[PDB]
Structures are given as structure tokens and as C-alpha cells.
Amino acid sequence: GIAGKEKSEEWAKYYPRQFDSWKKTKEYDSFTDMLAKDPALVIAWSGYAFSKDYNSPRGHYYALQDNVNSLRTGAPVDAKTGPLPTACWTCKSPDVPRLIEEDGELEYFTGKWAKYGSQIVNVIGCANCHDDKTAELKVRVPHLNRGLQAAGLKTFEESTHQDKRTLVCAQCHVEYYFKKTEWKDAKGADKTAMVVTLPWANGVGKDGNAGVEGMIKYYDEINFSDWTHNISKTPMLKAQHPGFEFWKSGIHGQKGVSCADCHMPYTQEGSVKYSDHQVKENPLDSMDQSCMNCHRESESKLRGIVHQKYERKEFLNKVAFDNIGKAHLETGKAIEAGASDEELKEVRKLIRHGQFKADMAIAAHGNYFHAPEETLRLLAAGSDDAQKARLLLVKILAKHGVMDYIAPDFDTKDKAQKLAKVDIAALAAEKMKFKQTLEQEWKKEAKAKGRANPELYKDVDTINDGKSSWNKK
Amino acid sequence: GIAGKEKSEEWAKYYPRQFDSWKKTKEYDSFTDMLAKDPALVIAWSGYAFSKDYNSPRGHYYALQDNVNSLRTGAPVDAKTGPLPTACWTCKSPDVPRLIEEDGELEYFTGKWAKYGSQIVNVIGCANCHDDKTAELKVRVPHLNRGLQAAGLKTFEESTHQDKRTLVCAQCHVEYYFKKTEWKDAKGADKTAMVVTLPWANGVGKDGNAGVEGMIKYYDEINFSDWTHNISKTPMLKAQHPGFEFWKSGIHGQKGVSCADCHMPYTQEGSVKYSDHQVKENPLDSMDQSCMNCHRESESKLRGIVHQKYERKEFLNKVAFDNIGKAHLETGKAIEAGASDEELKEVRKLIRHGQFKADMAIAAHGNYFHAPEETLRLLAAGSDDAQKARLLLVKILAKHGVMDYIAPDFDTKDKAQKLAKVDIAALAAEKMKFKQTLEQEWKKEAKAKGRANPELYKDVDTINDGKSSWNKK
Ligand code: HEC
Numbered sequence: 001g002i003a004g005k006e007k008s009e010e011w012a013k014y015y016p017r018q019f020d021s022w023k024k025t026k027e028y029d030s031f032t033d034m035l036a037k038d039p040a041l042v043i044a045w046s047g048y049a050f051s052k053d054y055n056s057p058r059g060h061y062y063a064l065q066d067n068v069n070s071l072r073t074g075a076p077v078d079a080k081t082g083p084l085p086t087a088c089w090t091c092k093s094p095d096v097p098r099l100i101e102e103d104g105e106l107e108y109f110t111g112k113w114a115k116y117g118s119q120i121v122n123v124i125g126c127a128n129c130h131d132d133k134t135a136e137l138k139v140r141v142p143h144l145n146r147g148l149q150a151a152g153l154k155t156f157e158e159s160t161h162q163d164k165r166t167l168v169c170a171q172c173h174v175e176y177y178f179k180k181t182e183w184k185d186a187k188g189a190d191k192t193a194m195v196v197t198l199p200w201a202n203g204v205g206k207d208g209n210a211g212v213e214g215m216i217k218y219y220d221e222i223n224f225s226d227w228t229h230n231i232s233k234t235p236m237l238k239a240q241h242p243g244f245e246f247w248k249s250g251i252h253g254q255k256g257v258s259c260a261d262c263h264m265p266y267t268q269e270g271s272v273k274y275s276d277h278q279v280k281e282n283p284l285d286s287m288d289q290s291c292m293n294c295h296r297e298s299e300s301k302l303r304g305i306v307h308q309k310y311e312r313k314e315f316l317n318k319v320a321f322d323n324i325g326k327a328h329l330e331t332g333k334a335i336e337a338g339a340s341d342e343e344l345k346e347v348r349k350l351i352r353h354g355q356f357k358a359d360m361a362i363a364a365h366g367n368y369f370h371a372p373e374e375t376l377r378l379l380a381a382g383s384d385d386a387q388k389a390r391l392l393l394v395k396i397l398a399k400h401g402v403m404d405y406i407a408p409d410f411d412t413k414d415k416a417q418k419l420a421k422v423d424i425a426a427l428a429a430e431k432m433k434f435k436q437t438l439e440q441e442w443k444k445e446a447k448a449k450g451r452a453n454p455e456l457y458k459d460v461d462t463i464n465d466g467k468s469s470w471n472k473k
Numbered sequence: 474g475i476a477g478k479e480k481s482e483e484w485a486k487y488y489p490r491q492f493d494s495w496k497k498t499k500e501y502d503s504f505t506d507m508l509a510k511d512p513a514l515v516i517a518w519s520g521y522a523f524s525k526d527y528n529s530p531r532g533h534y535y536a537l538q539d540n541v542n543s544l545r546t547g548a549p550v551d552a553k554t555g556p557l558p559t560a561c562w563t564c565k566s567p568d569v570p571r572l573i574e575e576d577g578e579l580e581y582f583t584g585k586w587a588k589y590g591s592q593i594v595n596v597i598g599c600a601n602c603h604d605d606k607t608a609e610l611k612v613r614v615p616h617l618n619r620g621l622q623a624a625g626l627k628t629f630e631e632s633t634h635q636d637k638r639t640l641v642c643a644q645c646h647v648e649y650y651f652k653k654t655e656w657k658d659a660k661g662a663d664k665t666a667m668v669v670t671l672p673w674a675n676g677v678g679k680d681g682n683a684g685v686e687g688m689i690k691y692y693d694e695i696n697f698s699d700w701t702h703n704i705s706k707t708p709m710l711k712a713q714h715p716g717f718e719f720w721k722s723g724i725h726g727q728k729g730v731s732c733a734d735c736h737m738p739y740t741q742e743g744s745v746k747y748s749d750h751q752v753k754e755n756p757l758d759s760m761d762q763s764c765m766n767c768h769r770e771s772e773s774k775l776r777g778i779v780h781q782k783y784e785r786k787e788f789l790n791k792v793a794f795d796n797i798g799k800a801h802l803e804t805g806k807a808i809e810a811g812a813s814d815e816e817l818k819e820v821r822k823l824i825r826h827g828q829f830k831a832d833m834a835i836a837a838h839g840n841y842f843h844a845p846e847e848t849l850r851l852l853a854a855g856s857d858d859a860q861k862a863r864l865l866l867v868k869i870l871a872k873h874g875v876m877d878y879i880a881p882d883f884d885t886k887d888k889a890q891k892l893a894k895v896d897i898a899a900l901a902a903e904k905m906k907f908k909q910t911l912e913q914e915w916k917k918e919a920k921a922k923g924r925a926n927p928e929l930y931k932d933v934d935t936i937n938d939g940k941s942s943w944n945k946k
């Protein structure tokens with residue numbers, strides 16, 4: 001066994017090669033401000049946290065700190081304030097399964113994100129994927145098995161080794177929602193938990209289908225919405241990195257090539273063979289071990305073939321979100337023009353469904369390569385749903401005496417956030433205050449109670465490197 | 474050499490195995506009436522021959538007879554009548570390169586289809602793909618090299634052996650248009666030819682791109698249109714089986730897997746290994762021969778994987794053509810309501826472009842599998858172009874006093890053909906009359922002049938087998 005299991009440093013003496021390679025994800029220190037790259041996204045997520053801050057993923061090394069640095073988590077004053085719940089910690093630290101094991105799952109999912117600010121202090125580590133006694137692959141978060149069984153699939157424990165080499169990634173790289181769960185503790189006090197739940201009841205990655213249509217069917221049946229759009233007033237569904245669901249629909253997934261085969265290639269230093277734990281941000285940069293063992297041709301040729309896929313996805317991504325953004329703005333105009341909720345009934349259903357399809361397609365960044373067919377198909381479907389809604393809107397507008405309406409420009413993050421009612425300067429000030437106050441208090445208490453050793457990872461908070469999405473001071 | 478090489482039966486004595494397997498395409502005797510299956514196609518091609526008769530492909534054995542049987546070729550009464558030109562024989566017979574070599578290319582392309590009715594009497598044969606003296610692969614139709622060179626690709630003769638195994642198919646399975654060409658013969662007479670031309674000036678199959686965008690650029694630049702849509706009055710572009718262009722864009726094409734690898738798989742009879750000349754209508758039905766030499770997988774699983782691709786394509790196909798169909802009808806309503814050509818300029822450009830993208834995606838039946846990515850992307854693009862045009866149309870219609878217009882239904886061949894101004898009962902009557910008179914007179918002369926031996930292929934005309942698209946009783 002390993003004492004202080006959540007502290008990956010502790011494993012280093014037993015497994016130096018895995019520890020050293022694991023820490024190398026520190027090298028993946030760059031992310032792209034997606035709201036600045038594709039401002040239409042701000043309009044799509046208007047009224048939601050994602051319209052504030054949303055960057056591409058970077059090294060696992062920065063997972064915990066980026067979750068803290070993001071405008072999405074806001075600026076809490078204490079453990080009872082802040083916009084987001086405890087569930088936001090779930091896929092960022094080994095301290096998560098620890099707390100679930102100690103205090104219970106429901107208790108872990110009860111309260112504000114700030115509640116565990118001092119408890120959840122170690123980044124995605126060894127304990128998130130391995131047993132401390134045997135080092136065998138292991139998943140300690142109960143949401144995964146719950147989703148697998150809902151999808152009619154085997155639990156992690158009933159799966160094969162190759163299945164697990166993928167499932168230890170799926171414990172986080174999946175689509176989910178927060179299920180409001182009412183419960184009662186030991187003392188008999190009624191509480192409310194927001195439980196990470198995978199909407200897999202209708203299956204995922206089944207015969208080439210990512211599972212999006214089934215998810216929509218499920219979400220509508222339980223009448224769930226992540227938020228109400230602040231422009232169109234549409235009950236919306238947010239998609240989040242459905243890496244596993246899409247991977248399962250793609251050819252590699254259908255052929256049994258695990259995430260680990262491409263992202264954690266086997267390697268050999270001297271006479272010792274081991275798995276490279278620097279989860280590769282871009283396997284195309286390590287083609288020799290990530291691909292060429294199964295593919296026989298030039299690396300430049302294969303990298304070129306993959307780039308064509310990125311171009312195709314980008315082409316449909318732009319079309320879909322431009323249509324979706326206009327659909328929201330035009331719905332806002334219709335409301336202003338006097339259109340009733342009943343009149344907007346069908347329009348809203350199509351915007352909800354369409355954006356979810358399009359969002360799911362782009363929410364897992366590797367989708368364009370892992371699952372090009374479902375990705376292109378869903379961007380096509382989401383775009384069409386939006387266009388279908390826009391055709392109804394032109395008629396509704398005309399009926400209300402509005403002709404030739406043209407939605408405003410949302411071609412820059414600034415213009416879009418203005419339309420979304422987001423004051424980034426204010427949020428940045430409030431967020432910077434938090435980081436200089438409460439956050440440092442968290443790291444102070446954590447070090448004092450031996451919960452973490454932040455001195456070993458000082459280069460983790462890069463908020464001031466001049467590459468921040470919101471801290472442009 | 475081989476005298477009367479246009480008569481494939483003359484090659485039997487030298488290459489019996491290739492001849493007997495070539496004849497077995499006779500077994501692929503079924504086609505699907507695509508206008509009955511997807512009546513939206515009738516609206517799409519309204520004002521053009523394809524709105525009358527369009528079936529899926531069937532055995533090479535039936536190519537010439539199906540060309541003669543189609544309502545598209547009409548009912549000529551003599552050598553100077555009939556709706557179509559000589560170019561329609563071009564990819565149906567070995568007598569084609571014979572006529573080009575004897576009479577010259579421009580002369581072969583000058584005149585009505587009926588002009589060569591008693592000369593083009595042998596179906597796709599050995600001579601279409603082989604030199605009669607050496608049996609080496611050979612292409613004798615100049616349009617291919619002309620297209621290849623236009624696309625910056627090597628000529629057939631300069632291509633590799635593996636390239637040639639694809640090019641002997643590309644001589645016919647490609648997109649083309651008729652180029653009105655003014656010329657003067659040896660005796661000083663001025664003539665006009667309609668030359669088969671591949672619109673490849675902007676390249677085809679380049680880095681994952683089928684080449685549709687470049688073709689639109691080309692066609693627009695030369696102000697060419699295949700026909701003026703009779704409902705929307707849009708100058709339209711018709712796509713025709715761009716098998717090679719799409720194949721080149723897919724993974725198999727990019728990896729050098731030729732059409733012949735899957736469609737003319739090697740076979741072993743006793744100690745003789747040769748190419749199976751029964752060009753496989755559905756290679757999935759001969760997986761062991763057509764795929765397992767490169768893939769190690771269960772037949773049901775591989776077939777299931779490919780079927781997924783068909784479902785994805787069918788999903789986007791229906792969406793694109795329903796939007797395109799409604800766009801044409803709504804444009805027709807706009808014309809009736811009083812919209813000018815100036816008011817409809819952008820609407821028509823979008824319809825022309827959108828339909829061409831969608832049509833190219835579905836025009837080569839195997840595209841869904843050969844090139845799933847470009848197929849899905851182009852159907853998405855085509856559908857979007859149609860939706861953009863429809864958004865403009867609601868506004869145009871409203872400005873002309875038309876509110877909430879609902880296009881008529883086109884869910885059955887009968888309904889759509891009526892909207893298309895196609896009197897199939899009448900067309901069928903005159904076609905049958907042509908078949909019973911002139912066609913038979915063509916057959917008589919052919920046998921008498923020793924140009925063909927029709928008795929050897931008595932089962933080729935299946936117009937009365939009960940599965941004709943138009944000959945219904
Ligand atoms: C509560 C609603 C959450 C907040 C706030 C954040 N997450 Fe996550 N998260 C997960 C993965 C697999 C990734 C990487 C893949 C990807 O980003 O597409 C992320 C990444 C982040 C990031 C960095 C990127 C960004 O700027 O958006 C932030 C700031 C972040 N997450 C905040 C996985 C999970 C997960 C597992 C099931 C859950 C429940 C959440 N994340 C919840 C939140």
C-alpha cells in the first residue's frame with residue numbers, strides 16, 4: 001500500500017519511469033482561447049458559464065489549476081459561495097475518489113465548488129487509474145460503471161485489459177450532466193446533491209452511432225436542461241468532451257485500438273519496457289510509436305491525411321455555429337416582435353436539438369480524427385436543425401411585421417460577449433481577487449495539513465504568462 | 474491480332490477464363506428505379522432527361538441495352554432524330570474507340586445518338602481495356618488523357634501499373650459534360666461536335682478533396698449549364714458518376730488500392746491464378762476475395778461497418794434533396810408571385826451550386842464507401858446552400874404578398890413527375906414503338922453487316938421481365 005496515495009510524488013520511489021513521464025505533460029503548456037478563435041461559440045452558450053471562458057485542453061499537469069483559473073468556477077468568498085458545485089472537481093484530482101470513499105458519494109456531490117477548495121489539491125494522478133497495492137488499472141469514481149450499465153455495457157471490472165486501457169480515460173473524457181439528487185444524511189438532514197451522471201441509457205458508440213440521438217431522447221424524456229439561453233430563451237443542452245462515445249463510433253474504436261495505444265505508447269529505456277505516461281497531446285508528433293507500428297507508409301503522408309480531416313470538420317463547424325448563432329439572435333428578435341412561446345415551440349426544439357448535435361461533434365477535440373464520420377454527420381444535422389428553425393423564424397417575423405431582419409455581427413470575442421451580456425473585465429477583476437485571496441488561503445491550509453506539496457509544482461499556475469484567455473493585463 | 478476485336482466473343486478462344494467471368498456480369502440483372510425510390514430526384518432534375526428515367530447501375534453485360542432502353546435516349550425515328558447526341562454511346566461499347574479511330578474523334582462526337590444505332594452494337598468489352606495483340610491494359614478514348622492532363626496528372630501510358638488498374642475504370646466512371654466544339658472537316662464543311670469532356674482543370678482527388686469546388690469554379694467561368702430547370706428556371710449543372718474523383722479522395726484511393734483490387738479480385742482455378750472479370754457489383758458479397766487479402770476481420774462485422782456508412786449517407790441524402798426540392802418549388806412560387814431574375818440571382822446561384830455538390834455526392838453509387846468523408850461533407854454543403862436560398866426566398870415571397878407558402882408534396886414518383894411536367898405514359902408509348910421498330914432494324918443491319926452477333930446475347934433486353942422502371946403493365 002501507499003500512504004498519501006493522492007500525492008503522486010509518493011509513487012515515484014516505486015515507479016520512477018511512469019512518474020517521470022507522467023510529470024512531462026507539464027510540457028503541454030499551451031491552450032487556445034476558443035471563444036476568441038470561434039466567437040460564434042459565445043452566442044451559442046449565451047447565458048451559460050462557457051460564454052465567459054472556454055479554452056482548448058492542455059497538459060494533465062495543469063488540470064487542477066486550470067479548473068481553478070477558469071472564469072467558469074467564478075470567485076467564491078467562502079465555502080458557501082460561487083456559481084458552480086462540487087461536481088466540478090470530479091475529473092481533476094485523485095483527491096476526488098478519496099473524498100467519495102471517506103465521506104460518501106452523495107456528500108461529495110453536495111455543496112459548492114469552494115467547499116473542497118482546500119481538500120482537492122493534487123492534480124490528476126496515479127491514484128486516478130491504479131490500485132496502490134498492485135498497480136493494476138482501476139477506476140474509483142462510481143459514475144463510470146453507472147453509465148456503462150445504463151448503456152448495456154460491462155462494468156470496468158468485468159471488462160478486458162484492452163477495454164480498461166480505454167476506460168481509465170473514459171472515467172473523465174465523456175459527456176455528462178449534473179443530476180439533482182435529494183437525500184438525507186446520518187443526522188437526518190435533507191440535502192441536495194448535483195451528481196455527475198452519464199446520459200447513456202439509450203447506448204453509446206453503438207454500431208457507428210456516437211449516441212447523440214439517444215441522449216437527446218433521454219434528456220427530453222426527463223425534461224432536463226443545462227440552462228435557458230439568455231437571448232432565445234431556449235431550454236438548452238450543453239455538450240462536454242464526449243471522447244469515449246465518439247471514439248467507440250470510429251474505426252479505431254470499432255477495431256479495438258485503445259486511447260492508450262496512441263496516447264500512452266509502450267517504450268523501452270535500456271532493458272526496461274514501460275508505458276509512456278506523458279499522455280500525448282498530439283499523437284501525430286510521435287507517429288513512430290503512436291501509429292507506424294500498425295501503419296506502413298510515410299509519416300508526412302499520414303499526417304497530411306489527418307489534416308484533411310481537420311479541414312473538413314472546420315468547414316462544417318463554421319457553417320453550423322454561424323447558423324446556430326443567427327438562429328438564437330433571430331429568436332430574440334421574434335420575442336421582441338411579439339412572438340409567443342407557443343409560436344416559438346418548434347423553433348426552440350430545433351435549436352436545442354441542433355446545437356446539442358453540433359456541440360457534441362466539436363466538444364471532444366479529437367473527434368475530427370477519432371470519429372470523422374459521426375463528427376461530420378452531426379455538424380451537418382445540427383446545422384440543418386438550425387436552418388430549419390431559421391426558416392420558421394423568417395415566417396414568424398414576417399407575421400409580426402418584421403421584414404429583412406439581419407442579426408448583429410459576432411465575429412470577435414468582444415462583439416459576441418457584448419451580445420451575450422458578459423462583462424469580462426468585471427469577471428476578470430473579481431476572479432483575480434479570488435486567486436489573490438481565497439485561493440492562496442486554500443493552498444496555505446492544504447500544505448499545513450499535509451494534503452499536498454505545492455512547492456514541487458510551482459510552475460502550475462500560468463495565469464500571468466501573458467497567454468491567459470481572460471487575464472490580458 | 475484479333476479481327477473483329479469489338480466482338481468480345483472473338484477473344485474467348487485465347488482467354489477463356491477472363492471471357493467466361495466477364496460474361497457473368499449477366500448475373501447482375503437487377504436495378505432500382507431511383508426516381509421511385511427517391512422521388513425528390515425528379516424535382517431536382519425537372520426540365521431534364523433524368524426526371525423521366527434514372528435507375529441504379531446493373532451488370533456491365535446490360536450497359537448497351539440499358540442505354541438503348543432508357544427513356545433518356547428517347548424514341549428516334551431515323552439517324553437525325555432523337556433528343557440526345559452521339560456522346561451517349563461513349564462509355565457503353567468497344568465500337569466507340571473503333572469509330573473514333575476510323576472516323577476521327579470530332580466526327581464521332583458529331584450528330585444525333587441515332588446516327589450510330591447500327592454501328593455501336595457490342596457491349597463494354599475486352600477491347601475497351603486491352604490491346605488486342607498483347608492484352609496489355611489500354612485506353613483508346615482520348616477524353617481520359619485530356620482530363621488527366623488538365624488535372625496535372627500523368628497520362629494513362631505514363632501511369633504505374635497499379636494506377637492503370639484504376640484508370641481502365643476511370644475511362645467511364647467519371648463526371649463529364651458535353652463541350653460544344655466548332656470544327657471543319659477534311660472536305661471543308663463546318664461542323665458542331667458535342668465532346669465528352671472531364672471538367673478537371675482545377676484538379677480532382679487532391680489531398681482528400683473530390684474536386685467539386687474546382688469544377689464549380691470551372692463551369693461558372695465558362696458559363697456552362699446542362700439545362701435550365703423548368704420550375705425554378707435555374708441554370709443547372711448535372712453530376713454523373715464521379716467514381717474516380719471521389720475514389721481518389723478516400724483512404725483506399727490515397728493508399729493506392731485500385732478499383733480492380735476490390736472489383737476484379739484475383740482468383741485461383743486449379744493451378745491458374747487470374748483476374749476475376751465478373752466486375753463485382755457488390756464486393757462485400759465476395760469479401761474473402763475482395764477484402765480479406767488486406768483485412769483480417771469477420772465478414773458480418775466488416776459488412777456491418779460498411780452498412781453504417783450507407784445509413785449516414787442516406788440520412789444526409791434525404792435531407793439535402795428534400796431541401797433542394799422545396800427550394801426549386803419555392804423559387805417557382807416566387808416567379809409566379811412576380812419576383813424578377815435580379816431578385817432571384819443569389820437564390821439561383823445557391824441552388825445551382827448546392828444541387829451540384831449534393832448530386833456529385835450521390836451520383837457515384839459507391840461514394841458512401843469509397844469516400845465517406847467527402848460524400849458526407851458535400852451533402853451537408855449542398856443541403857446548406859439550398860437552405861440559404863430558402864431563407865432568401867421566404868423574404869422574397871413575403872415582399873410579393875405570399876405568406877407561409879407550403880411547397881406541394883413530391884413523395885411519390887407519380888406526384889413528382891406531374892410537378893415536373895413529365896408524361897411517362899406518353900414517353901413509354903413512343904419508347905416502346907422505337908424499340909419495336911427502329912431498334913430491331915438496327916439489330917438486323919448489325920447482324921447482316923457482321924458488326925455483331927446478337928444471338929449470342931438473347932437475354933440482354935429485359936424490358937419485359939416485370940422490373941422495368943417505365944414499362945409497367
Ligand atoms: C464543472 C462544471 C466543471 C468545470 C468548471 C470544469 N470541468 Fe472539466 N474537463 C474534463 C475533461 C476530460 C477535460 C479535457 C477535454 C476538453 O476540455 O475538451 C476538461 C477540461 C476542463 C477545463 C480546461 C478547458 C477549458 O478551459 O474549458 C476546464 C477549465 C474545466 N474542465 C472545468 C472533464 C470533466 C468532467 C469529467 C466527467 C467533469 C464532470 C468536468 N470536467 C466538470 C468541470
Ligand code: HEC
Nearest residue numbers: 008011015018019022124125126129135165168260274275
Ligand atoms: C490513467 C489516466 C493513468 C494515470 C494518471 C497513470 N497511469 Fe499508469 N498506466 C495507465 C495505463 C493505461 C497503463 C498501461 C497498462 C498496460 O499494462 O498496458 C499504465 C501502466 C502503468 C504501469 C504498468 C507498467 C507500464 O506499462 O508502465 C505502472 C507501473 C503505472 N502505470 C504506474 C503509474 C504511476 C506511478 C502513475 C503516476 C505517476 C501513473 N501510472 C499514472 C494509466 C494511467
Ligand code: HEC
Nearest residue numbers: 057169173243244247252257258259262281282283365366
Ligand atoms: C489513435 C488511433 C488514437 C486513439 C485510439 C485515440 N486518440 Fe485521441 N487523438 C489522436 C489524434 C491523432 C488526435 C489529434 C491530435 C491533434 O492535435 O490534431 C487525438 C486527440 C485527442 C485529444 C485532443 C487533445 C487536445 O486538443 O489537446 C484528446 C482529449 C484525446 N485524443 C483523447 C482520447 C481518448 C480519451 C481516447 C479514447 C477514448 C482517444 N483519444 C483515442 C489519436 C488517438
Ligand code: HEC
Nearest residue numbers: 025057058059060062063066091169172259263279280281
Ligand atoms: C480525469 C481525471 C481524466 C483522466 C483519467 C484522463 N484525462 Fe485527459 N484530460 C482531463 C483534463 C481535465 C484535461 C485538461 C487539462 C487542462 O489543464 O486543460 C485533459 C487533457 C487531456 C489531453 C491533452 C493534454 C495532455 O495531457 O496530453 C489528452 C490528449 C488527454 N487528456 C487524453 C487522455 C487519455 C488518452 C486518457 C487516458 C489514458 C486521459 N486523458 C485520462 C481529464 C482526464
Ligand code: HEC
Nearest residue numbers: 251255257261262283284290291294302305306372724768
Ligand atoms: C494499431 C494498433 C493501430 C494504431 C496504433 C493506429 N491505427 Fe490507424 N488504423 C488501424 C486499423 C485496424 C484501422 C482500420 C482499417 C483496417 O486495417 O481494418 C485504422 C485506420 C486508420 C485510418 C483510416 C480511417 C480514416 O479515418 O481515414 C487512418 C487515417 C489511420 N488509421 C490513422 C492513424 C494515425 C494517424 C495513428 C496514430 C495517431 C493511427 N492510425 C494509429 C490500426 C491502428
Ligand code: HEC
Nearest residue numbers: 527528529530539540543545561563564645646669714836
Ligand atoms: C462515360 C464518360 C459516360 C458517358 C459519356 C455517359 N455514360 Fe451512361 N453510364 C456511365 C457509367 C459509368 C454508368 C454506371 C454508373 C452509374 O452511376 O450509372 C452509366 C450508366 C448509364 C445508364 C444505366 C443507369 C441509368 O441511369 O438508368 C444509362 C441508361 C446510361 N448510362 C445512359 C447514358 C446516356 C443517355 C448518355 C448520354 C447523356 C450517357 N449514359 C453518357 C458512363 C457514361
Ligand code: HEC
Nearest residue numbers: 481484488491492495598599601602608638641733747748
Ligand atoms: C476493363 C474494364 C476491362 C475489361 C472490359 C476486360 N478486362 Fe481484362 N483485365 C482488366 C484488368 C484491370 C486486369 C488486371 C491487369 C493486371 O495486370 O493486374 C485484366 C487482366 C486481364 C488479363 C491478364 C491475366 C489476368 O489477370 O486475368 C487478360 C488475359 C485479360 N484481362 C483478358 C480480358 C478479356 C479476354 C476480356 C474480355 C472478355 C477482358 N479482359 C475485359 C480489365 C478489363
Ligand code: HEC
Nearest residue numbers: 530642646716717720725730731732735755756757838839
Ligand atoms: C475496395 C476498397 C473498393 C475500391 C478500391 C473500389 N470499390 Fe467500388 N465499391 C466497393 C464497395 C464495397 C461498394 C459498395 C457495394 C454495395 O452494394 O453497397 C462499391 C460500389 C461500387 C459501385 C456501385 C455499384 C452499384 O451500385 O451497383 C461502383 C460503380 C463502383 N464501386 C466502382 C468503383 C470504381 C470505378 C473504383 C475505382 C475508381 C472503385 N469502385 C473502387 C469497394 C471498392
Ligand code: HEC
Nearest residue numbers: 498530531532533535536539564642645732736752753754
Ligand atoms: C465504360 C466503357 C465502362 C468501363 C470501362 C467500366 N465501366 Fe463499370 N459500368 C459502366 C456502365 C455503363 C455501367 C452500368 C451498366 C448498366 O446496364 O446499368 C457500369 C456498372 C458497373 C458496376 C455495377 C455492375 C457490375 O458489372 O458490377 C460496377 C461495380 C462497375 N461498373 C465498376 C467498374 C470498374 C471497377 C471498372 C474497371 C475494372 C469498370 N466499371 C469499368 C461502364 C463502364
Ligand code: HEC
Nearest residue numbers: 251295724728730734735756757763764767775778779845
Ligand atoms: C488492400 C489492397 C486492401 C483491400 C483489398 C481493401 N482494403 Fe480496406 N483498407 C486498406 C488500407 C491500406 C486502408 C487504410 C488504413 C491503413 O492501414 O493505412 C483501408 C481502410 C479500410 C477501412 C477504414 C476506412 C473507413 O472507411 O472506415 C475499411 C472499413 C476498409 N478498409 C474496408 C474494406 C473493405 C470492406 C474491402 C473490401 C470490399 C476493403 N477494405 C479492401 C487496404 C485494403
Ligand SMILES: [Ca+2]
Nearest residue numbers: 176238239240
Ligand atoms: Ca452535458
Ligand SMILES: [Ca+2]
Nearest residue numbers: 649711712713
Ligand atoms: Ca456533368
